[PDB]
Design a protein around this motif. Structure first.
Motif, PDB file in Angstrom:
ATOM      1  N   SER A 107      33.997   7.500 -13.070  1.00  0.00           N
ATOM      2  CA  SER A 107      33.926   6.210 -12.377  1.00  0.00           C
ATOM      3  C   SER A 107      34.327   6.376 -10.921  1.00  0.00           C
ATOM      4  N   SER A 110      44.994  10.059 -16.020  1.00  0.00           N
ATOM      5  CA  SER A 110      44.043  10.980 -16.641  1.00  0.00           C
ATOM      6  C   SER A 110      43.864  10.641 -18.123  1.00  0.00           C
ATOM      7  N   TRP A 125      41.939  -0.042 -15.349  1.00  0.00           N
ATOM      8  CA  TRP A 125      40.879   0.852 -14.895  1.00  0.00           C
ATOM      9  C   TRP A 125      39.517   0.388 -15.415  1.00  0.00           C
TER      10      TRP A 125
HETATM   11  C1  IF3 Z   1      35.450   6.519 -16.372  1.00  0.00           C
HETATM   12  N1  IF3 Z   1      36.536   6.503 -15.402  1.00  0.00           N
HETATM   13  C2  IF3 Z   1      37.549   7.539 -15.421  1.00  0.00           C
HETATM   14  N2  IF3 Z   1      38.780   7.249 -14.992  1.00  0.00           N
HETATM   15  C3  IF3 Z   1      39.747   8.153 -15.020  1.00  0.00           C
HETATM   16  N3  IF3 Z   1      41.081   7.801 -14.572  1.00  0.00           N
HETATM   17  C4  IF3 Z   1      41.448   6.411 -14.312  1.00  0.00           C
HETATM   18  C5  IF3 Z   1      39.457   9.476 -15.500  1.00  0.00           C
HETATM   19  N4  IF3 Z   1      40.178  10.631 -15.664  1.00  0.00           N
HETATM   20  C6  IF3 Z   1      39.352  11.567 -16.170  1.00  0.00           C
HETATM   21  N5  IF3 Z   1      38.131  11.026 -16.335  1.00  0.00           N
HETATM   22  C7  IF3 Z   1      36.939  11.680 -16.874  1.00  0.00           C
HETATM   23  C8  IF3 Z   1      38.172   9.737 -15.916  1.00  0.00           C
HETATM   24  N6  IF3 Z   1      37.242   8.752 -15.869  1.00  0.00           N
END
Ligand code: IF3
Ligand code: CL
Length: 149
Positions: A20, A35, A87
């Motif tokens: 994102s 994470s 998030w």
């Molecule tokens: C889809 N959004 C997103 N937000 C994260 N942190 C808020 C994150 N950390 C690893 N990935 C693959 C992630 N994807």
């Protein structure tokens, strides 16, 4: 080029991959990040074992974008019990502070020749979220990002 990260003895550097871009923008606005569960535990252990004796750096990249989008320093341990749903998805649980240092898009073409001896010699641009980068390779990535124009 050599003005940046010439004095970075100690410390540890991790790749961050997000699915994102909106999550990254919120990270840049509020100097916070989260994470996966296993990724949080990795960064938490690194930050804690560092015990302040050096920086923990985060190399951010939106998955599929073809570029890294900046560098932040991790600035607190992981708080695991925090407000839900802040998030793009609810599955992102917990929070730690960061301080963003560079916000800039750097094409993978500038970095793909750097390989990770701890990840089967794969290009640094083919890393997964919270892949740790060996310090000498991290120094090369950080300098390229810092100086890219
Ligand atoms: C889809 N959004 C997103 N937000 C994260 N942190 C808020 C994150 N950390 C690893 N990935 C693959 C992630 N994807
Ligand atoms: Cl929060």
């Amino acid at each position: 080029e050599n003005l940046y990260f010439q004095h970075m003895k100690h410390g540890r550097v991790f790749i961050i991959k997000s699915y994102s871009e909106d999550d990254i923008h919120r990270s840049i606005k509020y100097n916070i990040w989260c994470s996966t569960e296993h990724g949080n535990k990795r960064l938490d252990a690194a930050y804690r074992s560092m015990n302040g004796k050096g920086p923990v750096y985060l190399l951010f990249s939106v998955n599929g974008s073809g570029h890294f989008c900046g560098v932040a320093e991790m600035k607190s341990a992981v708080d695991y019990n925090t407000c839900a749903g802040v998030w793009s998805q609810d599955k992102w649980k917990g929070r730690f502070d960061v301080r963003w240092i560079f916000v800039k898009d750097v094409p993978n073409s500038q970095l793909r020749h750097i390989r990770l001896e701890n990840n089967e010699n794969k290009p640094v641009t083919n890393s997964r979220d919270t892949q740790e980068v060996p310090l000498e390779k991290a120094k090369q990535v950080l300098k390229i990002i810092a100086s890219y124009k």
